[model samples]
Target: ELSEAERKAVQAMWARLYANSEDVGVAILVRFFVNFPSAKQYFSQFKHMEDPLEMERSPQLRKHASRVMGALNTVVENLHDPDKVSSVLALVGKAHALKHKVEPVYFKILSGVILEVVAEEFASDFPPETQRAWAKLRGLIYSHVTAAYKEVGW
Candidate 1:
């Protein structure tokens, strides 16, 4: 759970970032795949693509990126409502565990990717305090995701 000030910082930063979410989301995934090749296996649809530019051009990648940003948008929008947050994250956990079969570690990895991308996009806006705030928010997100993993007996 974030303190009141932390929540405000997160929401404010997200408001600026979400406006260009598609590019931001794609950039995050591209950087993630480039930095952590092991995680690329989960995205088999575009795994064969070697060129970063090609991956960015892939329709499937764009769709997945949009979905990722949409999830973040929901999280930012519903920061004031924990139940909504839990419900959405439960869906993410269940989908990944039961259907996608993604490893739990990827959540943390992607969270790190998100932070990097957010910082890159808004370096000036992301002061140390805002970075700390975003870090806490991502921790909360990871908690909900992992908690759902436990609920599903994963």
Candidate 2:
């Protein structure tokens, strides 16, 4: 359950972050890599951490990451965009379905890492309201992701 305060804060954070596509994209990538280092193997072609696009030499991995980032950016940019959010959620669900292993704890870890990053980036810019907003978004995303895994029996 989400508190009104949390919901409002998350909405504020979402609005701020979503205003800039680049930051939103980077945040998604950063959160993903931080939570799933193994996923980095998929982007091994990129020698430098600074330039993710440079990893394009590996078509498959590059495409995968690009797709993921693009979807994530859309979701973050427009929290109210249910269609876009659903699309990204479906992709996330499919990825978990393929893994065939239920790891609900991972979502919490991901949320923690994301919030830590956001707090560090925004610092004073991130007020208590923004933090609450992130908390609510995290809860929503985790619930949806976990439900997807459960639906697929993994």
Among these predictions, the greatest TM-score belongs to 1
Please provide, for model 2 over 1-154, each residue's C-alpha lDDT reduced to its tens digit, 9 standing for 90 to 100: 3456654566566556556645554555555664566546434454234444433234544455456456555665556566666667766875865663436666677567767777876677787766666676677777777777777777
Over the full model, what C-alpha lDDT does candidate 1 score relative to the true structure?
Answer: 0.85
Instruction: Compute the lDDT of residue 139 as modeled in candidate 2.
Output: 73
Worst 10 residues of 1 by lDDT: 41-50
Overlapping backbone residue pairs in candidate 2 total 3
What C-alpha lDDT, on a 0 to 100 scale, does residue 23 get in candidate 2?
Answer: 51
In model 2, the worst 10-residue window by lDDT is: 47-56
lDDT, candidate 1, residue 80? 86
Q: Considering every candidate listed, which one attains the maximal lDDT? A: 1
Return the clash pairs for model 1, or none. Answer: none
